[PDB]
Write a protein that binds this ligand. Structure first.
Ligand code: MG
Ligand code: MG
Ligand code: MG
Lengths: 136, 141, 45, 94
RNA sequence: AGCCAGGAUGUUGGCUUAGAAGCAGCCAUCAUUUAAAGAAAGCGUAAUAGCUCACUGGUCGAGUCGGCCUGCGCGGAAGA
């Protein structure tokens, strides 16, 4: 499960998530799974989806994960007053903007990557679309 | 040729005649004799050799017995005592187990006076090559 | 029969599975192997 | 071989370009060599299909603007972030 | 699309486990007669099986298939 091995600071301002995605082409594989919505992918989400596409291909071909959850998310538990300090880091997300290539894959037939990316797509909280490598 | 009228296959080797442990219970009962599996069975077995399994046609309109006339021995039965091993596929394709040759089986396959495919003694012969493959040997042709 | 808010799967559980729009719901009929029937909906209010 | 029909842009900037794309057209640009760049407007559907054959990105295409012929090669392309659409193209005079 | 056909031979497939004859699982996925016919498609299983299809010959006779950009709608939708 992905997580920064170490970081400069423990916690991070909430911030916002406007803008379009960077890194928008299939730049490693042959096929890609691309983001259509704006939002958060958790380290567990990336994993639930990664397993499925890897199940799906019987660990053939090759898989790239283009996103990484480097954003620490905190939460305040039950029975806690507001304030008295910032919550504790509980999990990690990567921020997703429309257009982010999430996963790439190659070494498999077009038909099979689609099944596999379809299977992962069911694990994610944002709409996605299936893409291909392109000259230029 | 006409339709469906009694016909089943299930033995092990022809140098026997009716054995028990294979089938025993299930080898005839819509007018077919278990006990009779001899007179007809060895109606052409003794006259050549004992040790190629040849199953064969029933035939029962509403009779109490059956006749059938037999045909040629199988093909797989030509890869234990004539060309290579018996463990069969062994481990069919992790190593290549053993091997045959172009000479081997062409003659033996080529004595079939009642079974195979093709007027070319070679096409039918080439087909026989495929079985040897089912158990992962080698091509030396 | 089972309900389901999705027939993508229950439509292909068998060759005679059809999909029909009786009244205004979508039923997956299959009159040979009925156990494979489904609907998408469940009535008015 | 590939033949593309273009009109010169009469406007420029973000508003105009967003309006061009709202009209199923899209801006593009022609540059290179001694002549000045030529801002042009292309038909979206027609060019989408053309550029869907790898041949497009390596063969010399011909753009037609007022019955004059410009020989170019595709040089860059900006695509929609997530739709099968084109936002813009660079052509260089071959 | 429909309906008539066929769907044959190496091969009852060798072989992994107690059957196996595609009949479970792993291995490969060869081969002939042809009009095509998968060492299989999945129901089924004491072994047969006895089903249909995948694929092709006939019949009909002019359309048919399902992806793309998009508009409005459908279902998803239970509370005092
Ligand atoms: Mg009613
Ligand atoms: Mg503005
Ligand atoms: Mg037809």
């Amino acid at each position: 499960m992905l997580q920064p091995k170490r970081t400069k600071f423990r916690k991070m301002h909430k911030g916002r998530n406007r803008g379009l995605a960077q890194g928008t082409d299939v730049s490693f594989g042959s096929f890609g799974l691309k983001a259509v919505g704006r939002g958060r992918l958790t380290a567990r989400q990336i994993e639930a989806a990664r397993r499925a596409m890897t199940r799906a291909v019987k660990r053939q071909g090759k898989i790239w994960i283009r996103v990484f959850p480097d954003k620490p998310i905190t939460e305040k538990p039950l029975a806690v007053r507001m304030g008295k300090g910032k919550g504790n880091v509980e999990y990690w997300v990567a921020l997703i903007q429309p257009g982010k290539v999430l996963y790439e894959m190659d070494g498999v037939p077009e038909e099979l990557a689609r099944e596999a990316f379809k299977l992962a797509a069911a694990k994610l909280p944002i709409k996605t679309t299936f893409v291909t490598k392109t000259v230029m | 040729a006409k339709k469906v009228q009694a016909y089943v296959k299930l033995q092990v080797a022809a140098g026997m005649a009716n054995p028990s442990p294979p089938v025993g219970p299930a080898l005839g009962q819509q007018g077919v004799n278990i006990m009779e599996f001899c007179k007809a069975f060895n109606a052409k077995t003794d006259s050549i050799e004992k040790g190629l399994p040849i199953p064969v046609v029933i035939t029962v309109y509403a009779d109490r017995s059956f006749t059938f006339v037999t045909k040629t021995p199988p093909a797989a039965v030509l890869l234990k005592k004539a060309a290579g091993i018996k463990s069969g596929s062994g481990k069919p394709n992790k190593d290549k187990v053993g091997k045959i040759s172009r000479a081997q089986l062409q003659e033996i396959a080529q004595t079939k006076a009642a079974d195979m495919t093709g007027a070319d003694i070679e096409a039918m012969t080439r087909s026989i090559e495929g079985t040897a493959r089912s158990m992962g040997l080698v091509v030396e042709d | 029969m089972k309900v389901l808010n999705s027939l993508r799967t229950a439509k292909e559980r068998h060759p005679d599975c059809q999909i029909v729009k009786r009244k205004g719901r979508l039923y997956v009929i299959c009159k040979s192997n009925p156990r494979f029937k489904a609907v998408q909906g469940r009535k008015k209010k | 071989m590939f033949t593309i029909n273009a009109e010169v842009r009469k406007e420029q900037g973000k508003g105009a370009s967003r309006r061009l794309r709202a009209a199923n057209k899209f801006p593009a640009i022609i540059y290179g060599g001694k002549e000045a760049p030529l801002a042009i407007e292309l038909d979206h559907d027609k060019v989408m299909n053309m550029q869907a054959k790898a041949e497009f990105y390596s063969e010399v295409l011909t753009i037609v603007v007022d019955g004059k012929e410009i020989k170019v090669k595709a040089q860059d392309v900006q695509r929609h972030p997530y739709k099968p659409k084109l936002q813009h193209i660079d052509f260089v005079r071959a």
